A paper describes a structure:
To accomplish this, we removed the N-terminal ankyrin repeat of DRP (herein termed DRPΔN). The structure revealed a novel assembly consisting of complexes with the stoichiometry of 1:2 sk-Alp14-monomer:αβ-tubulin and a single DRPΔN positioned on the top end of TOG2-bound β-tubulin (termed the 1:2:1 structure). The refined 3.2 Å 1:2:1 X-ray structure revealed an extended conformation with two αβ-tubulins polymerized head-to-tail in a curved protofilament. In this conformation, TOG1 and TOG2 did not form any interactions with each other and their adjoining linker became disordered. Compared to the TOG square, this ‘unfurling’ rearrangement required 68°-rotation and 32 Å translation of TOG2:αβ-tubulin hinging around interface 2 and TOG1-αβ-tubulin. This transition promoted the concerted polymerization of TOG2:αβ-tubulin onto the plus-end of TOG1:αβ-tubulin, and consequently drove the dissociation of the second DRPΔN. The two αβ-tubulin polymers in this complex were highly curved protofilaments (16.4° inter-dimer interface). Thus, the 1:2:1 unfurled structure represents a concerted αβ-tubulin post-polymerization intermediate promoted by a single TOG1-TOG2 subunit prior to straightening the protofilament during polymerization at MT plus-ends.
The XMAP215/Stu2/Alp14 MT polymerases are among the best-studied families of MT regulators. They localize to the extreme tips of MT plus-ends and accelerate αβ-tubulin polymerization in eukaryotes. MT polymerases recruit αβ-tubulins via arrays of conserved tumor overexpressed gene (TOG) domains (herein termed TOG arrays), which are critical for their function. Each TOG domain is composed of six α-helical HEAT (Huntingtin, EF3A, ATM, and TOR) repeats, which form a conserved paddle-shaped structure.
Numbering used by the authors:
A (entry chain E): 14 to 43, 46 to 259
B (entry chain A): 2 to 40, 47 to 279, 283 to 437
C (entry chain B): 1 to 42, 45 to 57, 59 to 360, 369 to 441
Write the structure that this text describes.
C-alpha cells in the first residue's frame, strides 16, 4: 500500500500516512531502502499538499516523525530537503486554519532549520510569503520567523548584513498592515531582533519609520525584557553544535 | 496670489461643482473656459492657457470613479484638464482607517504629484482650500492624510478647510461620529482655518426659506456654494478685508486650536416681496436660524466678527446698522478682544445659478464670527462618539484596516481638550 | 465596489437562487433569452452588479454548485435555466446524504477546486469585485457542508471582498432529516467566523407565515420560496438600483454590524402576498411601517419584543411621500424606544426606491440586527444537545473524518454567540 499514499480516495491516503508514521518510528537506525523518502523528497512535498485537510494533517505528523528520524548520521542531504519541503510547509501548513495542522508544520520548520548550518537558508524561502494576499498566512509565518530567531539566532550565517537588511526590509510594511494580527506579530518580531542586537541599531534603521504609538509599545516591550542585551546562549542548538 | 482648491470625496467633489459653476458665472467664464473680455484678481483661482483658456486651479480626488466621472461628462468636462480629476476604484466605505491607512495610501503619491503640477504653474502660491466631509471615509480619512503631507511638503503655506458637518437627516453612515472625531484630531495641527457646514443647518434653511419640503444634495450644494463664494470673493476680487489666506487667520484665529469660525449668510430668498435693506440683512446674520452650524452664540462669547458685504451696499448704511445691532442685541466679546467689527464691501451683485432655487438679490452679507458657542457642535459629536465607543461598537472595522485602537482614545482626548480650550477662552 | 459574484450551493441553494434570478431578471427587464426588454433606464443604471455582457445580451454572474446532478437539470429545465452560463454549472454526481461532514470534509472538498476555478473566472472579468453572495441551507449536506467550505476557501483567496450569505434555517415543521440540528450547528459555527453578513431565513417562520397568515393548510416549498425570493429582492434593492444609502456591501455591513460576530440579520417585509395574482389592499405608508416592525412579517422565528434592535435598515419601494416615510420611521422609534439601542445614535436608516417589485405598487423590506435572534440559536442549540447528549447519529460524521471535539466546539461557540446577543441586550447608556 506504499503507492496508495497518492490514491484517489482520501481514506486510503490517510491510512498510508499513518503507516508511514509507524515505519519512521519503528524502523532501523544505522535504515531500510524502503525508507527512500530522502532522495525523492517530492513524495512528502506532495503529501503535505493533500487536498483533504484530515489526511493532510496526518501527512504532516508523519513528516514530523520522519524529520526527527533522519537525525541520524550521515544525512547531510538536509540541504535538498529544505528547498523542497518548507515552501509547501509555509504555503499550506502555516496558512492552514487548523490549529493542529499549523502547530506541526511549525514543528517541522524547526527541525528542518536545525538540520541546516544556519538560519539564512530557511529565512530566504519563507521571506516571499511575507507579501501574500492572505493575512493569516503572513500573520503566521512572521510569528514563525520570529520564533526561528528567538531560539536559533544569527550564528554561522554568511553575511548577516545581507540577512539583517533582507528581513528588515518588509518590517515597515508589516507594521502598517491592515490586519490586527499581522501588526501584532510584527511587533513581536521586532522584539526578537531587539533581543539579539541593541536598541541603537533598529532605531537607526527601523523604529523611526513606525507609528509613534507603535514605537512607544516597543519601548514598553523592551522594558519588560529582563535578559542581557544579547542572550548569553542560544535557546536551541543546531545539529552540528550538539555534535562538535 | 494663487490658491489651489482640493476637493476630496463625494461631498468635496459635488460641492466643488456648485462652487466652480458659480465662480464661472461670477467671472463670466463659459464652460469651455473662454471669456469675452479683451483689454486681474480672479487669476488667483484660474490659470490661462496660451490659447486664452481659463482653467481652475482645482484638484478633484475620490477613491471611487462614480462621482468624478459625472464631472468629466457633464457641462464642465472641458473646463478641467483630465489630469486634475483623480479617482481610485475601491472607496473607503465610510471608514476613516480605509481612507487614511489602507486604501488612501495607494493613491497619496499620485495626488501629491498632480498637485505639484499646479503648484509649479504658480509664481506666488498662497495656499490650499480643502473641501471634504466629516462622515465619509475619503472625506475624513484621506483628507487628514493629505493634510499631513501638505504640511511636510508645502510647510510654509496656509491651508483652509470647508468641512461638511454630518446630520442624521441625510446621514449615509452610522459611524460618522467616529470619522468626524478622527479627522478633526489628525487635522487640527495642520489646518489654519476650518469653516464647518452643518448639513442640518443647510437642510433646515432650504426647508424654511426656500420652501423645499425635502432638499436634495443639489439644493444644499447650491446654498453652500453661495457662502463659499462670499468667503473666497475677497481673494477673487480686489477688496480690503481678507485679501489673502494669511489674513483669515489674522482676523479670525486668536489661538491655533480655535480656528473654527461660524458663517452666517443672508438673505436667502426663494425664487417666486421687495429688496431688503442693509440693516435687515445685517440683523439676519445674528439670527441663529441663518447660521450654517446649529448653535446659540448667545450662550457663548465672541472673539471676532467680520461682515463680508456684497452688492448695493454703502458704508454709512453699514455703520448705521452695526451701531443699532451692537446696542440692541447681546454680542458678548471676550475682555481681551478688539471688540470691533471688520467690514468688507464688494459692489458686485450676488450671482445665483440661472433657473435655480435662489432669487437674485440686490445686496447680501456673509458674517464670519469666531464664537465659543460653536463648541456645542463638538459636544453633539463627542456624545454620539462616547455612546458607541463605550461599547467598542464598530471599532473592529477600523482596527481591521491598519488603525490601532488607542488612536480612538487619543482622538477623543484631543476633543476633550478642545472642549476645555473653548470653555477656558469662553469665560 | 461594483460587481457581485453570486453562488448557490445544494438543493435549497439552487432552488431559492433560481427563483431569485427569475425575480430580479424581470425587475431589470431581462427575458430568459438574456435580452433587455424593459422601459426605464434605472434598470440598466446598475445592471453590471449582478450581470455581465456578451458583446449577445446580459448574462447572470452566478455559479451553481451541487454534489448531486438532480437539481442541475431541474434548474436548466426551468423558465430561466437557459440564461445561465453553461460552464458555471459545477456539479458532482455522488451526493452528500444530508451530511455536513460529507460536503465540508470528504466529497465536497474533492469538488471545491472545480468551483474556485469558476469563481476565479468570473472574478477576472470584474473591474472591481465588490463581494460574494451565497444561498444555501444550514440543515442540509451540500449547501451546509460544502457551502461553508466554499466560504472559507473564498475567504483565503479573496480576503479583501465582502462575504454575504442567504442561509435558511431548518425546522421540524418542514424537516427532511433528524441530523439537521447537527448540520445547522456546525454551519452556524462557520458563518459566525467567516461571513461579514448573514440573512437568517427561518423555515419555521416561513411555514408559520404560509399557514397562519396566507392561510395555506399544506405549504409546499414553492410557497416558502416565494417569500424567500421576495425577501431577497428587497434586501438587495439598494445594491442594483441607484441609491445613496447602503449602496455597496461593505457600507451596509459597516452600518449594520457593530460587533464582528453579531452579523446575523432578521429580515422582514410587507405586504405578505400569496402566490396569487395581486391584492387590492394598496397599503398606505403608516401601514407599511406597522407591518414591517411586526413579528408576523419576520422571516425569522423571533419576537422583536424579546430583544433590542442594535441596527436597522429599512427599504421602501414604489412612488410614495418620502416626507411621510420619515414621520413614520421616526414615530416607531420614539414610540418604542425601549426596543432600540440607545448607545448607537441614529441606528435606523431608511432608503427609498421608486421602482416597486412586479405585482405591487408599494412595498417595504426590513433588515434588523436584533438581539432577539438568540431565540433562533437557542432553538437550534436545544435540538442539537437533545441528540448530542447520547451521541446519536454521530457515526456518520466521525466516519467522514470529523472528531467528536468539533461538535463540542461548534456547540460551545453557538452558545457563546447567544450569550453575547444577550450581553448587549442588557447593556445600558447610563
Ligand atoms: N451637503 C452635502 N453633503 C454631502 C454631499 N455628499 C456627501 N455629503 C455628506 O458626506 C457624508 C458622507 O461622506 P461622503 O462624502 O459621501 O463619502 P466619501 O467622501 O465619498 O468617502 P467614501 O466613504 O469612500 O464614499 C454624509 O454625512 C453626507 O451628508 C453633498 O453632495 N452635499
Ligand atoms: N425554503 C426551502 N428550504 C429547503 C428547500 N430545499 C431544501 N430545503 C431545506 O434544506 C434542508 C435540506 O438541505 P438540502 O438543500 O435539501 O440538502 P443539500 O442539497 O445537501 O444542501 C431541509 O431542512 C429543508 O427544509 C427549498 O426549496 N426551500
Ligand atoms: Mg464616495
Ligand atoms: Mg434535500
Amino acid at each position: 500500500l506504499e503507492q496508495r499514499a497518492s490514491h484517489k480516495v482520501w481514506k486510503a491516503r490517510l491510512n498510508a500516512y499513518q503507516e508511514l508514521n509507524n515505519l519512521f518510528t519503528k524502523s532501523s537506525v544505522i535504515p531500510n531502502d524502503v525508507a527512500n523518502y530522502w532522495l525523492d523528497p517530492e513524495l512528502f512535498a506532495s503529501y503535505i499538499v493533500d487536498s483533504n485537510v484530515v489526511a493532510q494533517e496526518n501527512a504532516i505528523i508523519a513528516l514530523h516523525t520522519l524529520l526527527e528520524y533522519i537525525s541520524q548520521v550521515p544525512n547531510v542531504s538536509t540541504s535538498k530537503l529544505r528547498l523542497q519541503w518548507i515552501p509547501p510547509l509555509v504555503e499550506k501548513g502555516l496558512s492552514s486554519s487548523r490549529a493542529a495542522t499549523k502547530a506541526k508544520a511549525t514543528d517541522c520548520i524547526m527541525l528542518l532549520t536545525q538540520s541546516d548550518t544556519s538560519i539564512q537558508q530557511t529565512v530566504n524561502l519563507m521571506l516571499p510569503s511575507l507579501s501574500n494576499k492572505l493575512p493569516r498566512l503572513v500573520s503566521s509565518c512572521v510569528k514563525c520567523l520570529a520564533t526561528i530567531i528567538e531560539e536559533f539566532g544569527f550564528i554561522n550565517v554568511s553575511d548577516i548584513n545581507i540577512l539583517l537588511s533582507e528581513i528588515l526590509e518588509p518590517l515597515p510594511k508589516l507594521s502598517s498592515h491592515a490586519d490586527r494580527n499581522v501588526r501584532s506579530e510584527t511587533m513581536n518580531l521586532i522584539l526578537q531582533i531587539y533581543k539579539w542586537f541593541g536598541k541603537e541599531l533598529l532605531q537607526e534603521l527601523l523604529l523611526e519609520k513606525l507609528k509613534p504609538i507603535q514605537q512607544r509599545d516597543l519601548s514598553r516591550m523592551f522594558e519588560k525584557y529582563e535578559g542581557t542585551i544579547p542572550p548569553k546562549q542560544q535557546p536551541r542548538l543546531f545539529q552540528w553544535q550538539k555534535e562538535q | 496670489r494663487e490658491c489651489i482648491s482640493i476637493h476630496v470625496g463625494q461631498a468635496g467633489v459635488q460641492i466643488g461643482n456648485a462652487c466652480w459653476e458659480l465662480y464661472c458665472l461670477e467671472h463670466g467664464i463659459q464652460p469651455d473656459g473662454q471669456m469675452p473680455s479683451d483689454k486681474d484678481s480672479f487669476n488667483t483661482f484660474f490659470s490661462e492657457t496660451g490659447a486664452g483658456k481659463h482653467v481652475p486651479r482645482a484638484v478633484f480626488v475620490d477613491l471611487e470613479p462614480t462621482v468624478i466621472d459625472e464631472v468629466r461628462t457633464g457641462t464642465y468636462r472641458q473646463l478641467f484638464h483630465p489630469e486634475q480629476l483623480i479617482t481610485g476604484k475601491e472607496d473607503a466605505a465610510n471608514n476613516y482607517a480605509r481612507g487614511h491607512y489602507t486604501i488612501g495610501k495607494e493613491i497619496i503619491d499620485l495626488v501629491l504629484d498632480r498637485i505639484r503640477k499646479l503648484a509649479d504653474q504658480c509664481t506666488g502660491l498662497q495656499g490650499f482650500s480643502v473641501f471634504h466631509s466629516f462622515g465619509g471615509g475619503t472625506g475624513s480619512g484621506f483628507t487628514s492624510l493629505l493634510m499631513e503631507r501638505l504640511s511636510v511638503d508645502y510647510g510654509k503655506k496656509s491651508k483652509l478647510e470647508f468641512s461638511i458637518y454630518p446630520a442624521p437627516q441625510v446621514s449615509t453612515a452610522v459611524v460618522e461620529p467616529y470619522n468626524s472625531i478622527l479627522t478633526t484630531h489628525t487635522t487640527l495641527e495642520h489646518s489654519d482655518c476650518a469653516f464647518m457646514v452643518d448639513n442640518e443647518a443647510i437642510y433646515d434653511i432650504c426647508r424654511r426659506n426656500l420652501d423645499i419640503e425635502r432638499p436634495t444634495y443639489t439644493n444644499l450644494n447650491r446654498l453652500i456654494g453661495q457662502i463659499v463664494s462670499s468667503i473666497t470673493a475677497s481673494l477673487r476680487f480686489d477688496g480690503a478685508l481678507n485679501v489673502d489666506l494669511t489674513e483669515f487667520q489674522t482676523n479670525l484665529v486668536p489661538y491655533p486650536r480655535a480656528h473654527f469660525p461660524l458663517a452666517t449668510y443672508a438673505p436667502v430668498i426663494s425664487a417666486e416681496h421687495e429688496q431688503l435693506s442693509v440693516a435687515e440683512i445685517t440683523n439676519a446674520c445674528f439670527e441663529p436660524a441663518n447660521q450654517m452650524v446649529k448653535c446659540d452664540p448667545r450662550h457663548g462669547k465672541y472673539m471676532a466678527c467680520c461682515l463680508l458685504y456684497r452688492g448695493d451696499v454703502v458704508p454709512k448704511d453699514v455703520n448705521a446698522a452695526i451701531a443699532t445691532i451692537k446696542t440692541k442685541r447681546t454680542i458678548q466679546f471676550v475682555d481681551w478682544c478688539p471688540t470691533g467689527f471688520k467690514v468688507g464691501i464688494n459692489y458686485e451683485p450676488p450671482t445665483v445659478v440661472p433657473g435655480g432655487d435662489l432669487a437674485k438679490v440686490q445686496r447680501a452679507v456673509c458674517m464670519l464670527s469666531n464664537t465659543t458657542a460653536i463648541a456645542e457642535a463638538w459636544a453633539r459629536l463627542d456624545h454620539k462618539f462616547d455612546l458607541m465607543y463605550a461599547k467598542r461598537a464598530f471599532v473592529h472595522w477600523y482596527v481591521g484596516e491598519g488603525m490601532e485602537e488607542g488612536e480612538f482614545s487619543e482622538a477623543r482626548e484631543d476633543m476633550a481638550a478642545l472642549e476645555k480650550d473653548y470653555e477656558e477662552v469662553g469665560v | 465596489m461594483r460587481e457581485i459574484v453570486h453562488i448557490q450551493a445544494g438543493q435549497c441553494g439552487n432552488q431559492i437562487g433560481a427563483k431569485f434570478w427569475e425575480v430580479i431578471s424581470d425587475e431589470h427587464g431581462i427575458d430568459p433569452t438574456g435580452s433587455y426588454h424593459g422601459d426605464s433606464d434605472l434598470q440598466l443604471e446598475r445592471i453590471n452588479v449582478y450581470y455581465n455582457e456578451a458583446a449577445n445580451k446580459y448574462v447572470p454572474r452566478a455559479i451553481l454548485v451541487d454534489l448531486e446532478p438532480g437539481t442541475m437539470d431541474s434548474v436548466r429545465s426551468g423558465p430561466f435555466g437557459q440564461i445561465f452560463r453553461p460552464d458555471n454549472f459545477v456539479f458532482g454526481q455522488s451526493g452528500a446524504g444530508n451530511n455536513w461532514a460529507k460536503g465540508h470534509y470528504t466529497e465536497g472538498a474533492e469538488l471545491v477546486d472545480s468551483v474556485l476555478d469558476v469563481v476565479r473566472k468570473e472574478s477576472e472579468s470584474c473591474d472591481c469585485l465588490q463581494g460574494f453572495q451565497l444561498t444555501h441551507s444550514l440543515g442540509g449536506g451540500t449547501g451546509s457542508g460544502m457551502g461553508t467550505l466554499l466560504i472559507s476557501k473564498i475567504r483565503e483567496e479573496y480576503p479583501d471582498r465582502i462575504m454575504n450569505t442567504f442561509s435558511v434555517v431548518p425546522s421540524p415543521k418542514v424537516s427532511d432529516t433528524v441530523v439537521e440540528p447537527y448540520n445547522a450547528t456546525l454551519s452556524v459555527h462557520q458563518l459566525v467566523e467567516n461571513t461579514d453578513e448573514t440573512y437568517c431565513i427561518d423555515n419555521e417562520a416561513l411555514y408559520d407565515i404560509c399557514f397562519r397568515t396566507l392561510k395555506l393548510t399544506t405549504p409546499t416549498y414553492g410557497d416558502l420560496n416565494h417569500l424567500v425570493s421576495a425577501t431577497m429582492s428587497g434586501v438587495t434593492t439598494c445594491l442594483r438600483f441607484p441609491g445613496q444609502l447602503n449602496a455597496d456591501l461593505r457600507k451596509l455591513a459597516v452600518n449594520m454590524v457593530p460587533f464582528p460576530r453579531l452579523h446575523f440579520f432578521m429580515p422582514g417585509f410587507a405586504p405578505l402576498t400569496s402566490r396569487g395574482s395581486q391584492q387590492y389592499r394598496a397599503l398606505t405608508v403608516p401601514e407599511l411601517t406597522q407591518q414591517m416592525f411586526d413579528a408576523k412579517n419576520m422571516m425569522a422565528a423571533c419576537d422583536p419584543r424579546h430583544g433590542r434592535y442594535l441596527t436597522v435598515a429599512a427599504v421602501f419601494r414604489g412612488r410614495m411621500s418620502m416626507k411621510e416615510v420619515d414621520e413614520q420611521m421616526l414615530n416607531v422609534q420614539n414610540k418604542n424606544s425601549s426596543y432600540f439601542v440607545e448607545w448607537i445614535p441614529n441606528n435606523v436608516k431608511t432608503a427609498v426606491c421608486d421602482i416597486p417589485p412586479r405585482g405591487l405598487k408599494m412595498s417595504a423590506t426590513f433588515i434588523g440586527n436584533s438581539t432577539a435572534i438568540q431565540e433562533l440559536f437557542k432553538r437550534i442549540s436545544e435540538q442539537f444537545t437533545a441528540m448530542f447528549r447520547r451521541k446519536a447519529f454521530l457515526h456518520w460524521y466521525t466516519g467522514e473524518g470529523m472528531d467528536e471535539m468539533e461538535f463540542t466546539e461548534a456547540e460551545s461557540n453557538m452558545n457563546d454567540l447567544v450569550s453575547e446577543y444577550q450581553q448587549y441586550q442588557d447593556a445600558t447608556a447610563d
